[PDB]
Design a binder for this molecule. Structure first.
Ligand code: MG
Ligand code: MG
Lengths: 248, 248, 248, 248
């Protein structure tokens, strides 16, 4: 086990990559504070964990609301005594819309969830970890944190911004035992990409060196490693899980 | 003359890098729409342009307000008939504050000006330029768009976000006559920077391979070149003007 | 056990990072072909592996000689029957010498070992792995594959070259069952580094966000993970183990 | 004029991007030392320059031979008194060959010309510039200095290596007034790409945001700017001229 005895929080854990991250953290021996804006999906992730003999609680949060992060910290300390690990996993892309046609609401919503929500989490997490001797934070960025993808200017800006805030936090808090890294998935086999046409999926697949999409466990495995004491010299860094996407 | 007969917009043109960009645009023959949140400062840059025989007007805009960008486009159209070039110069980093102590207001203000304001500007500028055959946009990022600087998490996030949205927009509009690139200054001898102790400047200087700080004209020269038809194969890219800061 | 039943080759395995990589591979259950230019050092690493109950052999190779790579493949095939994993660990930077004073012999030696030797190894390893269904290759680069370090132009060139050839090979062989990635250590507490003055180490330490040097096990842990089936969506990519060095 | 009164050397100047660089340097007012391994092509470039009223000489060099660089320096000092500017422009890709099939001679030849030849030039140039108060060096890298291109492992490694050696030289010599930068062209309309099929050229074109190939003047214009006093805060940096290639 990678994470025996450690307490981990995961945001956006009711579905997709966040759900797998939560399940993997618990399989690696972590106590997990599952969070999602959906109570139904969040509680289902919790039930998944408990059904496999893991230790977890569910706490609702809208990560775009600063105040909800304090409730997350509170839940961790109350259930498990300390926060060792946090994963800021978040929103989706939004709809594909050219920049000239992108509305204020699209820009604001994507920025809110995928960038501001990460800052608010990271700020609360740091505070908590500083009390119990440090810890490890992983921010889920994207390949869109390194390259651009047409139609999703807001997400690209957000995901780049996550890569940046990882860098400055690493230097601000490295002395004090907080590691922080970003993870950059490419296209992963989750709901949204499952609903598009075989032709479009083949097109996406062909943008990867491995010529397939990734699985959520392939991302989670990385996240779990970066969250572990095996990663103790790893901070301020972007870790792709991109099947070679960025390499061409 | 790199820019004879062109019409350029410069945001944050009231002082520092943005003032010099505006002057250098006029010196290279462009008509200039001077913008700034401060009307007094914006009017001053206009006065310096006009003093040398340049053609310019001033138009107030709060670039954090989406609607004010329409007034800038309109001013360009009213004074000179079209928009050929835009430089989104944006602002400053705010006070150095570690992430765990950075307030909601700090985060929201710096994001709003240095990231959202650039998106609202790029959006408006694309729309305008598409009416008359295209043009060139230069976004001023920072070294902070590529590395972290302790104490300015919000600015680092924003400036990384700027590098990302440049990439997307370049692919979205590359066939439609629009080039867009980002510029990454390091520490530049502005009035703000001038006042810090010879010791602290000696510390900033030593972070550059040239072992000095840059001048605003060294930034503006690059911006002018990137805005010109000499740069006709240059798009989607980040151009440091950093005296070697990123190279170590 | 990340690597049960796998057979791994490690070059430059006689000491430092390469010795620890080899041990950690054996500890994770792989058979290990130990290689090094120094037979005494290579035999020592073999002895430490065998002492713990690991399965290993030693095979001399000068990795700068293309033909010696054939002897390494053959040793893997003779002792364990196939090659599943290879780590091209390569060497050291040589003496710090400014570019204008760097000799032909310095340039040619460092390029030969740290760049050409990696290409000859990757070439041989690809050929071998293609015979039995594929495998995983990890190239040890450096922070010097992403930034410059004064006095080691040849090493900087080589280590950047390693990051590049990783990218190409990943696309060339990604459909044929081969993953390849690069690892970028910063300054690591090897015997070489251990002997430098507490002052000079304090200067190297301060260049890392963790404000210390790394341990060879912190590098090897990453290498082992990247060599394993947990890393099944990871290819073409650079994975720092740099304690935050690149983040400023 | 950008370069009035300055003396510039260009390598690989008998054809393609190097020839255009030479012609542009001379149009910008520089005295030019044209160099190529082909005397015939080299002398034709010289005649082009002289026919437009420029000042230049031709000096043969094989840039893979260290000794030939001393002859280049000697020619500059003898004809024009000093070296202000140098452009290390070089070889070609070689044949497209998968890594497992690439021979020792292919790896050695491409590395020799595109990497070692750049180091040997840079080493000689530094020495010369240090005598007359510094200057500016531009290294022609490629998009292959940032990404991988299947079939050209040697060129990818070489072009990455050029990006790296630019970084360390910038820091070693920034104090002493030497600027050094790399330029990264994408696919440019030169002989080799002119001879491939419309279908293949359309495929290449489609890898650029501008959806066309670049022209040699678009590259030279950049090189000339980076070689000029307008670029005085620009060093250690990679400047794409890639039509947006790297941005996706
Ligand atoms: Mg790409
Ligand atoms: Mg740095």
């Amino acid at each position: 086990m990678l994470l025996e005895g450690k307490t981990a929080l995961v945001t956006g854990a009711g579905n997709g990559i966040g759900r797998t991250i939560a399940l993997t953290y618990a399989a690696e021996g972590a106590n997990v504070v599952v969070s999602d804006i959906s109570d139904e999906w969040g509680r289902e992730t919790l039930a998944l964990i408990e059904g496999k003999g893991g230790k977890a609680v569910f706490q609702h949060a809208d990560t775009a609301h600063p105040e909800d992060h304090d409730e997350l910290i509170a839940a961790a300390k109350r259930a498990f005594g300390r926060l060792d690990i946090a994963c800021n996993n978040a929103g989706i892309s939004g709809e594909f819309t050219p920049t000239a046609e992108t509305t204020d609401a699209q820009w604001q919503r994507v920025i809110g969830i995928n960038l501001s929500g990460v800052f608010y989490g990271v700020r609360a997490q740091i505070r908590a970890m500083l009390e119990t001797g440090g810890g490890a934070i992983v921010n889920i960025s994207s390949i869109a944190g390194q390259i651009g993808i047409e139609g999703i200017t807001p997400y690209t800006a957000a995901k780049h911004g996550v890569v940046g805030l990882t860098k400055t936090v690493a230097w601000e808090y490295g002395s004090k035992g907080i590691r922080i890294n970003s993870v950059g998935p490419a296209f992963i086999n989750t709901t949204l990409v499952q609903n598009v046409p075989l032709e479009t999926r083949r097109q996406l697949e062909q943008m990867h060196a491995l010529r397939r999409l990734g699985e959520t466990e392939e991302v989670a495995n990385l996240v779990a490693w970066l969250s572990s004491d095996k990663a103790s010299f790893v901070t301020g860094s972007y870790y792709a899980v991109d099947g070679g996407y960025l390499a061409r």
